[PDB]
Amino acid sequence: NLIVPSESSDTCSLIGFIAAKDDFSLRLMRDSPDIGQLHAAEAAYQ
């Protein structure tokens, strides 16, 4: 259960992290699907 006293908040929280360890390997580069679709985009040609 969660046991807090009468002065601490009844609601606590968890933060979860993730890291990769030193054996983490990666290959076959591609493009990321995260970004995808600009204002003043033609200003480089002006």
Partner: protein, 199 residues
């Protein structure tokens, strides 16, 4: 598999950075201010870092289409920082010797120049937390030293009686990439090429 994740192997990729079709009969040429902020795919790779030191390997790829394909000669003059960019196809700045022009044809293999590291400082500030101008009208996020230059491409030939569209694809491949101070990958979509506004 720890070698494909090298920043040299991660960023040195000849991605398309500029693509403009100009007619021939910007007025009948195009200049492209060399920034990495053009396409959202290479930009998010380069916005992973704060300071970049790369030599760009610009490969100008010119196609052509009418309205027999003519064999033209093109110029791909790189106007650096400080030098003046042409406003016309036949201006005097195309004849300027000190700019790095390269003369190629459509039927040749694509022209390829290695623009060196051309920041005043030791790396390109990808994100600049400052102001260029010395007044309050100066824009935010524009390093005065971040400017690569200007890639100005025209057709060296005179006027021909055929009217035809020239589409030029510019491919930049960074070289000798040294990258400092990695950042979070941007999750929200872009709103402009000048700044980091989010929606």
């Amino acid at each position: 598999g720890v070698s494909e994740t090298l920043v040299e192997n991660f960023l040195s990729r000849a991605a398309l950075v500029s693509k403009r079709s100009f007619e021939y009969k910007d007025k009948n040429f195009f200049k492209w201010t060399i920034n990495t902020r053009s396409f959202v795919q290479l930009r998010r790779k380069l916005e992973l870092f704060t300071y970049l030191r790369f030599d760009a390997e610009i490969t100008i790829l010119t196609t052509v289409a009418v309205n027999g394909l003519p064999d033209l000669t093109l110029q791909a003059m790189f106007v650096p920082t400080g030098a003046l960019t042409p406003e016309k196809q036949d201006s005097f700045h195309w004849q300027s010797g000190s700019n790095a022009s390269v003369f190629f044809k459509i039927s040749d293999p694509p022209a390829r120049i290695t623009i060196p590291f051309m920041c005043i400082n030791s790396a390109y500030s990808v994100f600049y937390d400052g102001f260029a101008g010395f007044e309050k009208n100066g824009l935010y996020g524009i390093n005065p030293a971040d400017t690569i230059g200007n890639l100005c491409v025209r057709i060296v030939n005179e006027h021909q009686p055929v009217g035809f569209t020239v589409t030029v694809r510019v491919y930049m491949k960074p070289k000798h990439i040294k990258a400092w101070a990695p950042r979070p990958p941007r999750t929200l979509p872009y709103m402009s090429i000048a700044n980091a506004n989010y929606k």
